Design a protein around this nucleic acid. Sequence first.
DNA 1: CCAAGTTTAGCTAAACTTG
DNA 2: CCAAGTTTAGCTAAACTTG
Lengths: 97, 93
Amino acid sequence: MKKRLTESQFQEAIQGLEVGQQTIEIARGVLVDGKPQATFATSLGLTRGAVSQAVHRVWAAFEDKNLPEGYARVTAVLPEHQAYIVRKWEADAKKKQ
Amino acid sequence: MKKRLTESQFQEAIQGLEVGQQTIEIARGVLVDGKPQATFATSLGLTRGAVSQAVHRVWAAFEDKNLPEGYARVTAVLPEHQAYIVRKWEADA
DNA sequence: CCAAGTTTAGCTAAACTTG
DNA sequence: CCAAGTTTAGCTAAACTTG
């Protein structure tokens, strides 16, 4: 019920995004129009898991585009201490609330 | 190519991994016994994609465990400069 | 408790990649 | 070409989480 976009936010999310029209329609109805995921499961004959994933794809896409300014995602295999530091960097940024 | 394992690496690989006996059989058949994926596609009535995925789940598992002692894969969203630092570190291998 | 939503190994399609 | 293998959005099952 919580977790939502504007049309403008939504349009950003789906720009470039490689997904079909069903996914788009489901995500808009849920994220923009505040309708329950369950009415799309029912109406489309789909499990609730499928609908949660559809909504998730558009959600995730929006987040990947709204990372704090200047910030980058990074992944790497690191030795223990260097890995610990990344954990601490993040965790100290989470305990910045 | 062509990626392969002993039955002992294979076991190390899948330890702690949630994986069914079918994925196990396909992965063993291909990575240990050296058989081709197409074999299992027919014998089990699966698509090539499914077999290709089965082999992948185990291979990725092995990869994560043949990593050097203490080494860990990590992911984060950081300020560029800290990301720069992580890339610099990660290059050092 | 309840009902809605989440998660993840594992499947398909079908376009793509490799040798 | 073709044979075999890769990729990834989309789906399920059904345990688990959330409100």
